[PDB]
Amino acid sequence: SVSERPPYSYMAMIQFAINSTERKRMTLKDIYTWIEDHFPYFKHIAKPGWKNSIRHNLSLHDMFVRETSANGKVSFWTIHPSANRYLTLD
Amino acid sequence: SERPPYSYMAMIQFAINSTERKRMTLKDIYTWIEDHFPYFKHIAKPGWKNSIRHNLSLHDMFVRETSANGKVSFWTIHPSANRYLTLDQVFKPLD
DNA sequence: AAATTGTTTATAAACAGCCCG
DNA sequence: TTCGGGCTGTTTATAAACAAT
Ligand SMILES: [Mg+2]
Ligand SMILES: [Mg+2]
16 A cells, blocks of 8 residues: 555665765755655645654754755755665665 | 743753762663653653653664673763763853 | 663644745 | 744654674
């Protein structure tokens, strides 16, 4: 059943999302979108606060490092270079 | 006796730093907090103790350590982040 | 065995600062 | 251009499920 809650922690799903990109970085919006796209539970069932929980995990875990672009500013979430196992959803 | 305006992380540091050796068992941390902030002795719901344990495990600044003799488990504070918080630092002189 | 201690994840909220229409 | 509200980031608290001692 494609829309039941996945057996992955927010921390796992955030990694899957970031590791799906060639540059191994992703904006917060794109992380919401990636998770919604891949785990429809979050697009159709989860209460609004799941997004609060994503942001909480981003700040909580030192493996998720924020990088602001050379512009001043656009900001991406990355995985610490020494942390990345390159866990992709496949 | 109102709930004091300090975080669990702050109060845990007060407790640990009150000892000679800058180390304290969990049960002594409970007792210390109860004795100095009676909100937790008399009013707080029982889950406050859960929150203490959560804090000790969550924050890397809190480092569990067995005595050299192996028998007691102590909580201590990490050297790369000991700002040395003690209760006495929280007191305003009266104006 | 039973209770205490220790770890991790989830959820909620307060709040600051930034962004943007 | 300012204004105000929504978005993003950080932090603290509470509960729970659970493992380990
Ligand atoms: Mg982080
Ligand atoms: Mg700890």
